[PDB]
């Protein structure tokens, strides 16, 4: 390794152009069928503790 190094300052228009893909994606969510509060699918709703219509933990 003879230690590679940038040739030229990456231009403004070129770096932002790279960051085209960096943007985030909002969480995906569902009402908890009892409390209608927001909650991610397939997890036990932290508002009550119900999943499959059964109380699962005593929130």
């Amino acid at each position: 390794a003879k230690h590679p190094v940038p040739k030229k300052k990456t231009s403004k228009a070129r770096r932002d152009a790279r960051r085209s893909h960096h943007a985030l994606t909002p969480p995906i969510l569902v009402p908890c069928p009892e409390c209608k509060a927001m909650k991610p699918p397939h997890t036990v709703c932290p508002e009550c503790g119900y999943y499959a219509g059964r109380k699962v933990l005593e929130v």
Binding site: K39, H42, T43, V44, P46
Partner: protein, 118 residues
Amino acid sequence: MRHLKSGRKLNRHSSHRLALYRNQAKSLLTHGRITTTVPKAKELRGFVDHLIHLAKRGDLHARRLVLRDLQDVKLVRKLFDEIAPRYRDRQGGYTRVLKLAERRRGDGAPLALVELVE
């Protein structure tokens, strides 16, 4: 090339990973439900499931095998005398795993609980 192989390493070597599997099995039989990461949980599942169904046999051999992991004499009694007869009429699958809507913090790991069923 993981092809058709099925286990898990959990970034732990063989000795460690094994111990982990016990100290979790251990604690699971102790407290009835525990909460770990989704992957540890997915794996751990069958480990306890195997010990339970071993106890369900009842014989000294069975007891002399489960003791090899659980190590503790009393938790062995606890296994055989209360846990296993719960399940004499449910074959296979003695535990459940459920995902937790709240994440971790300083590493944002996903979380899941593992309770045995009734």
